Amino acid sequence: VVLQRRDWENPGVTQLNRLAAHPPFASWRNSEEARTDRPSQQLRSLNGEWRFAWFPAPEAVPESWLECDLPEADTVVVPSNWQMHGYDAPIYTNVTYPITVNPPFVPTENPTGCYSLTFNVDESWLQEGQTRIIFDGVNSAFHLWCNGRWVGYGQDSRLPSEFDLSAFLRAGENRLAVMVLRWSDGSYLEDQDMWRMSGIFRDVSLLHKPTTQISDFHVATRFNDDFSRAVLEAEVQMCGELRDYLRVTVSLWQGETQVASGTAPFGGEIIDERGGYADRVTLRLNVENPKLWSAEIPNLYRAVVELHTADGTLIEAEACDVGFREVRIENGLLLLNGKPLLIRGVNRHEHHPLHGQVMDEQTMVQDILLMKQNNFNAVRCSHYPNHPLWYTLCDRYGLYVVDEANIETHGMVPMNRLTDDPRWLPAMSERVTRMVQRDRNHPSVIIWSLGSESGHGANHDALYRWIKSVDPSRPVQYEGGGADTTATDIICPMYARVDEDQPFPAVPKWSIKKWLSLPGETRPLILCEYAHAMGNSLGGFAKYWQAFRQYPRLQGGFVWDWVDQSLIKYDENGNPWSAYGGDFGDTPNDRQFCMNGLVFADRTPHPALTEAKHQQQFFQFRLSGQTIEVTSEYLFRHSDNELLHWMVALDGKPLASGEVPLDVAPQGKQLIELPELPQPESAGQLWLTVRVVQPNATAWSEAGHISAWQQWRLAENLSVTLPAASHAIPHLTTSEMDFCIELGNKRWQFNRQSGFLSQMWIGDKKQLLTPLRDQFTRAPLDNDIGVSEATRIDPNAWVERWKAAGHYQAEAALLQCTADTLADAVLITTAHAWQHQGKTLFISRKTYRIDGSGQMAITVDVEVASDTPHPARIGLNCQLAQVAERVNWLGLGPQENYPDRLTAACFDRWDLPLSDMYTPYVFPSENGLRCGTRELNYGPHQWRGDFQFNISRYSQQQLMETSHRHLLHAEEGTWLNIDGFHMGIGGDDSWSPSVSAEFQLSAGRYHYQLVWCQK
């Protein structure tokens, strides 16, 4: 029957013989075990070593495999994705389906994974009760056999499939045979932008339930007006024979204290003309002054559901963690426990660079600790239901969750082709309904989502309404079809900008400020996706947070996204490197578009993370005189693990510092008057820096964790003292080819044909490997390249405009080169024009003034043609011969910062190893810039002025020519880029120009000055 029916090519068949979905079960036969959440003897894991064999199609699987192990098969760990074991290639595609679009058909060549397990079943399990097998995740469709007999079938890669094996199992030795298909009709609803894999990638288990059993249970909590009283309402459903002696007891535990209890026989209230549910009962428990759940304080209670005889025999117990909270939308605002939320969120895919899409506790816990340490309070399950442990962990650590159905049909044309088709409604409804049935008891889930990028179809409306009837406790959102359709309680656009309209036909992305006030619109707006963190990104992030804080109805959003989807490959010498689309022979592919994370695959932060942490701070600061006003953005907690550390410094030199305990009510204020400050001796700018420090460790942070910070300029005393006059005076030496300047051991050489400083000496040691030259270009960022699909050569992209204007191939044509001798200095004057095909793009006019002290003052004025695309930078570069261990600077840091991503950086004296001055973006680009720099020290060199710089062993040229970071090689000496001016990086999205006007170099005329000397 199985090969004939071809169930994996029929959206009308999404399962066979599959059991009903339900909340997590353990079937404890001891109530105390249930309470403490200790392991259950009735829930066994079948994870570990399985047997596996790959096939090109299901028609190639031999019948013998149903009964006997195949000799050609290997022993593999389960859960796993079979691509991660090397059996076939993972595919990275974004929108375009990895298969020909021909619903409901898949390719005849359909990679088939044959999994099998020989395992033991105890006699005790088969004498009584029910033995079921649970597969938490199988991608993307599968048939199941037990001891050679067919059991069933299932689709949906991201929710558990359960089968009753009671009549299939024998005492002692049993064998499972699972035929997993890579492609099925289910794949048409699984077109998420991520690695396309397959296999048994989540936990497998055996559960024993009694014949008379808890088959379902729902927990609700409702409150009076000020949350001083709650009612816990637990609806419990049974299966098996109805008996008058049967009871359910639901008891509520706060630690080891029972706070509430209720017991009742089965038989619900009358529902309609035919009576009520004889197989259900609802328990109502009164709770006075409940401890409320939130991400700020994740207060949890324990609910234990006992099924038992009246006279006291426990049949079984189920249990869950209960968080008392109310989620409602009122008057256009999303409220949690009566208070308006501000969502500091992030999208998070389930991705591991070694294990692919298999999730583990350690990784999960790691992710949560980093999110909370970086001031996130919410996560979106983009774009499928997660591993069941994720929710438990979010309940316990405190994160607001958006639980999202596994429905994405992005590659369809138009996007709603299937979601508007009533024939796809059954397949879609199982992906929504079974999610809700599984996760409805987790306090951390506050919002349901109908899926991702599937346009808007009538099926969405039907399923929106289904959730609303079944679970009134949670708002429902969905972005497709324009982010504000009738299938969403929340305006939830992706990549809508703060002030800029993007008026696409049918599905415009209005400026979020404008969107709120469109005629008739009243809903809250929370971006489901914003600030695309692809490579060197997150420019303009502060602009979002400013608008979120000013507008009540702008209640935040979810950054796209948490972690790069790079996978580990190994080179000829067994050395690991990070791979993206195309690196596995996968084609068509979308290259590096799988890497949009705030963190690297191994969870090392990108520089953007610190920008996110800073803007998402829960404490706001204003300064008036010597009074710091701290304002709390917490809604529920007092600042009871917080102290303020303040520091005043003069150009990096500490003058005063102290600490004050923070004592701020949620939403409240505190004034801190700083003590009288000592008057600075020397000249320069005083800077105030404040840091909020957590003295005590928490479940999510170490003692001393810095949670917030801010800087201000205080008094400035401008230097009026002239430099001490020098006795020495530098000598010029002229030839037709050179101007040579000499002063003691120091020597400068200007080439008279090129017009640049070609060499410089200290002692008799050369300092340059490449002349000092103007630079108007950068190795293009992912945002500059602005493609989301490998096939779209966009002429509007910044990189393409720079290329077509000739910025990268413009040649310096000398206009002027003269020398002059002054009373105490030699003065070199130069002018260059940069030209491409008869057009002058840039003109650079310079003076180099070398005096008796040993200092060279470089004055640069630049003209930029108004009709050429604004240049990426305006500065100078050279390759220094010296390689030093350290880089020391007075400017913004310590991390990489760009003009539209520098709010998190602090002005101070920073000192890092050279390697920390390069950011290892997997796809290489301009990187490691630091802005607001007044002084830079590298070996014997010092530069002074007001500039931006990067410094590393890689030229802008190498960076733009090398596709992968691991293929880079340290060049001889050190490449220095010193910019008077640098363009923003953008990032509102990564596939259209996104650098805001105020960060574009459009002023036409530019001036900067630098002083180079030896220390």
859 touching Mg ion, by CB under 5 A: no
Q: Which of 163, 991, 1006, 1008 binds ligand 0MK (CB under 6 A)?
A: 991
Q: Nearest Cα to 296, choosing from 328, 339, 257, 349?
A: 339
> Can residue 529 be called a binding residue for ligand 0MK (CB under 6 A)?
yes
- Choosing from 36, 788, 942, 1014, the residue that interacts with ligand 0MK (CB under 6 A) is 788
User: Does 851 help bind Na ion (rule: CB under 5 A)?
Assistant: no
The listed partner (ligand 0MK, Mg ion, a second copy, none) that binds 502, CB under 5 to 8 Å by sort, is: none
Three-state SS for 23-78 is CCCCCECCHHHHHHCCCCCCEEECCEEEEEEEECCHHHCCHHHHCCCCCCCEEEEE
Q: Which of residues 389-448 bind a second copy (CB under 8 A)?
A: 406, 410-418, 422-427, 429-431, 433-435, 437-441
Is 296 considered catalytic here? no
d(CA 304, CA 300): 13
- Is 439 near Na ion (CB under 5 A)? no
> Of 453-472, which residues contact Mg ion (CB under 5 A)?
453
Identified binder of ligand 0MK from the candidate list 33, 88, 136, 193, rule CB under 6 A:
193
Q: Which residue among 456, 746, 807, 873 contacts a second copy (CB under 8 A)?
A: 456
Question: Breaks in the chain at C–N > 2.5 Å: after which residues?
Answer: none
Q: Which of residues 593-612 bind a second copy (CB under 8 A)?
A: 593-594
Footprint of ligand 0MK on residues 88-107 (CB under 6 A)? 94-95
Q: What are the E-state strand segments in 788-824?
A: 811-821
- Give the residue from 271, 289, 288 showing the smallest Cα distance to 280: 271
| CA atoms of 437 and 61, how far apart (whole Å) | 35
CA dihedral of 236, 237, 240, 245, whole degrees rounded to 10: 40
Among 26, 34, 42, 90, binds a second copy (CB under 8 A): 90
Annotated catalytic residue within 529, 896, 926, 935: 529
The pattern of x and - marking residues 126 through 165 that bind a second copy according to CB under 8 A reads ----------xx-----------------xxxxxx-----
Q: Given 453, 611, 896, 926, which residue is catalytic? A: 453
Q: Is 596 in the site for Na ion (CB under 5 A)?
A: yes
991 binds, among ligand 0MK, a second copy, Na ion, none (CB under 5 to 8 A by kind): ligand 0MK
Radius of gyration of the CA atoms of the chain, in A? 33
Residues annotated in the binding site, as ranges?
94, 193, 408, 410, 453, 529-532, 589, 593, 596, 991
Q: How far is the CB of 593 from a second copy (least distance, A)?
A: 5
Cα–Cα dist 752/734, whole Å: 10
Q: Give CA–CA dist 620/618, Å, rounded.
A: 7
Output the CA angle 717-719-725, nearest 5 degrees. Answer: 165
Q: Could you say which of ligand 0MK, a second copy, Mg ion, none residue 185 binds, taking C-beta under 5 to 8 angstroms by partner kind?
A: Mg ion
Residues in contact with ligand 0MK, counted by CB under 6 A, come to a total of 11
Query: What does 788 interact with, of Mg ion, Na ion, ligand 0MK, none (CB < 5 to 8 A by kind)?
Result: ligand 0MK
What torsion do the CA atoms of 950, 955, 957, 960 make, to the nearest 10 degrees? -60
From 2-10, 240-248, 962-970, 1004-1012, span contacting Mg ion (CB under 5 A): 2-10
Pairing of strands 906-913, 886-893: antiparallel
Which residues are CB-neighbours of 362 under 8 A, at least 6 positions away? none
**Residue found by looking up tokens 């969403």 in the block:** 488
Indicate which of ligand 0MK, Mg ion, Na ion, none lies near residue 554 (CB less than 5 to 8 Å, by partner kind): Na ion
- In the complex, minimum distance from the CB of residue 479 to ligand 0MK, in angstroms, rounded to a whole number: 8
Contacts 24+ apart (CB under 8 A), 660-665: 662/619, 662/630, 662/692, 663/638, 663/639, 664/619, 664/630, 664/631, 664/632, 664/638, 664/639, 665/632, 665/638
Site for a second copy in 260-299 (CB under 8 A): 269-278
Regarding 557 and contact with Na ion (CB under 5 A), the answer is no
316 in catalytic set? no
Q: How far apart are CA 797 and CA 755, in angstroms?
A: 33
472 binds a second copy (CB under 8 A): no
Tokens representing 457? Answer: 């179809």
Q: Which amino acids are annotated as binding site for Mg(2+), given as ranges?
A: 408, 410, 453, 589
46, 77, 333, 462: which one binds a second copy (CB under 8 A): 462
Cα→Cα distances 850→173, 240, 739, 824, 942, Å? 89, 96, 12, 9, 15
Residue 623 CB, shortest distance to Mg ion, in Å, is 44
Does 106 bind a second copy (CB under 8 A)? Our answer is no
Q: Is 350 in the site for ligand 0MK (CB under 6 A)?
A: no
Site for ligand 0MK in 439-498 (CB under 6 A): 453, 494
Antiparallel, parallel or unpaired: β 554-559 and 525-530: parallel
Instruction: With beta carbons less than 8 A apart as the criterion, state whether 492 and 447 touch.
Output: no
Residue closer to Na ion, measured from CB, 110 or 958 = 958
554 vs 333: CA distance, rounded Å: 9
Question: 770, 758, 875, 879: which is closest to 817 by C-alpha?
Answer: 758
Contacting residue, 71, 585, 675, 763, with a second copy by CB under 8 A: 585
For residue 594, the minimal CB distance to ligand 0MK (Å) is 8
* Residue 113 binding: pick among ligand 0MK, Na ion, a second copy, none (C-beta 5-8 Å cut-off by kind): none
Which of the choices Na ion, Mg ion, ligand 0MK, none does residue 924 contact, using the CB cut-off of 5 to 8 A by kind?
Na ion
Q: Between residues 185 and 479, which has the closer beta carbon with respect to Mg ion?
A: 185
If one asks whether residue 988 binds Mg ion (CB under 5 A), the answer comes out as no
Are 62 and 554 a contacting pair, CB within 8 Å? no
Tokens, residue 96: 């375009």
Where does 881-986 show beta strands of DSSP type E? 886-893, 906-913, 930-938, 941-952, 974-982
d(CA 936, CA 154): 63
Q: Is residue 564 close enough to count as binding Mg ion by CB under 5 A?
A: no
Site stretch for a second copy (CB under 8 A), options 357-365, 382-390, 629-637, 916-924: 382-390
Task: Work out the burial of residue 100: count CB atoms within 10 Å of its CB; fewer than 13 is exposed, 13-18 middle, 19 or more buried.
Answer: exposed
Shortest distance, position 332 Cβ to a second copy, whole Å: 22
Task: Quickly tell me which residue has 């400068």 as its tokens.
Answer: 748
207 closest CA partner among 162, 238, 263? 162
Q: 959 — alpha (psi -120 to 50), left (phi > 0) or beta?
A: alpha
Q: Which stretch binds a second copy (CB under 8 A): 504-512, 759-767, 791-799, 962-970?
A: 504-512
Q: Which is nearer to a second copy, 273 or 885 (CB)?
A: 273
How many helices (H) and strands (E) in the chain? 13, 58
Q: Which does 423 bind (CB under 5 to 8 A by kind): a second copy, Na ion, ligand 0MK, none?
A: a second copy
C-beta closer to ligand 0MK: residue 136 or 453? 453
479 binds Mg ion (CB under 5 A): no
Q: Which of 11, 385, 480, 924 binds Na ion (CB under 5 A)?
A: 924
Query: How many CA atoms within 13 Å lie on the side-chain side of 128?
Result: 8
Size of the site for a second copy (CB under 8 A): 112
Q: Give the Cα separation of 877 and 845 in Å (integer).
A: 16
Binding test (CB under 6 A) with ligand 0MK, winner from 164, 235, 663, 789: 789
Give the x/- contact pattern for Mg ion in 405-434, rule: CB under 5 A.
-----x------------------------
The alpha carbon of residue 280 and the mean position of all alpha carbons in its chain are separated, in whole angstroms, by 42
Neighbours of 38 (CB within 10 A): 11
Residues in contact with ligand 0MK by CB under 6 A are 94-95, 193, 453, 494, 529, 560, 596, 788-789, 991
Residues in contact with Mg ion by CB under 5 A are 7, 10, 13, 185, 193, 410, 453
Residues in contact with Na ion by CB under 5 A are 193, 548, 554, 593, 596, 924
Q: Which residues are catalytic?
A: 453, 529
